Structure 1
Amino acid sequence: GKCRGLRTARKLRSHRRDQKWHDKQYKKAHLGTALKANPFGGASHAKGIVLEKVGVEAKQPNSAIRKCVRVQLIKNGKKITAFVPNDGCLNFIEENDEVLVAGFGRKGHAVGDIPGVRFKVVKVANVSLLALYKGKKER
């Protein structure tokens, strides 16, 4: 059972504060190492400069080669294989560009075809790959 007496509300506080760290979610949300180890500095999007193009392998039931870009963030200085999203559009991304990047779906995981990619290209010099793919605005 519990400590159900009338004056035990310190004991329940001290116990409930002690068990909440074993959740995965509260420990990443409220320990400092999640804020100061990751890229993006605790933001949502980030502009970054292309170091090079990198084409990574794939996992086994979906055999392919995925086409990605290594990125030097202006903010952080870190290195990131951001997935080039669309169907062509390896072409529309080049060397030394403004490359807005963001995550795929959840910051603690990846999408299940790639060895390590977590990140995804948006802008090419303030021109989105939605624009570049169709609507043909400008490079």
Structure 2
Amino acid sequence: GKCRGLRTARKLRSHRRDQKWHDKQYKKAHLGTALKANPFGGASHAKGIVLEKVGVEAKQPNSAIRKCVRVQLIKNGKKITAFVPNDGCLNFIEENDEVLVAGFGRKGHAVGDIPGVRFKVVKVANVSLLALYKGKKERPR
């Protein structure tokens, strides 16, 4: 602190109050703009409907094709490219399927090789994509 007056409580509090806005992690949480522009509307997960299956070219170094899924969210009507996890799990996603969709892990930031894809597909037609991959549940059709 740069005012050690005994009667300086408000300058020290009112400075700190003003300088907390220059923090990212604070400015984000304490404005509507981060919580509005969030496609999930501040929710953890979100059910949406697959409208196409999309190949996304991996980043500069490594070079695969990352199989993601273009999603119309129910609650918002908003557009999302959400990644599909492990080997050969895009074979489990028929078009126009209700998929439960979570974040990727970095609180709405793009992960690894996948440019501007912040989401993974968790369940497809209310059946878990780990259970389909392990073959425990069979896809109800």
Short-chain TM bin: over 0.9
Q: Which ranges of structure 1 fall in alignment gaps of 5 or more residues?
A: none
After superposition, the C-alpha distances for 1:47-74 in whole angstroms (9 at most, x for unaligned) are 0101111111111211111111000010
After superposition, the C-alpha distances for 1:7-53 in whole angstroms (9 at most, x for unaligned) are 00011111010100111100001011111111001110000101111
Per-residue deviation, 1:136: 3.5
Distance 1:74 1:33 in 2: 21
Distance 1:101 1:129 in 2: 11
Distance 2:90 2:122 in 1: 12
Query: 2:133 matched to 1:98?
Result: no
Q: Which residue of 2 aligns with 1:80?
A: 80
Distance 1:77 1:109 in 2: 21
SS in 2 for 1:35: helix
Distance 1:40 1:87 in 2: 26
Distance 1:105 1:74, change over 3 A: same
TM-score w.r.t. length of structure 2: 0.94
Distance 2:105 2:96 in 1: 26
- Percent sequence identity is 100
Q: Which ranges of structure 2 fall in alignment gaps of 5 or more residues?
A: none
Per-residue deviation, 1:107: 2.1
Per-residue deviation, 1:105: 1.0
TM-score w.r.t. length of structure 1: 0.95
Distance 2:70 2:53 in 1: 6
Per-residue deviation, 1:116: 1.3
Per-residue deviation, 1:102: 0.8
Distance 2:91 2:108 in 1: 30
Distance 1:55 1:137 in 2: 26
SS in 1 for 2:67: strand
Distance 1:21 1:66 in 2: 37
Distance 2:90 2:108 in 1: 26
Distance 1:33 1:116 in 2: 19
Structure 1 stretches of 4+ moved >2 Å: none
RMSD: 1.2
Q: Which residue of 1 aligns with 2:12?
A: 12
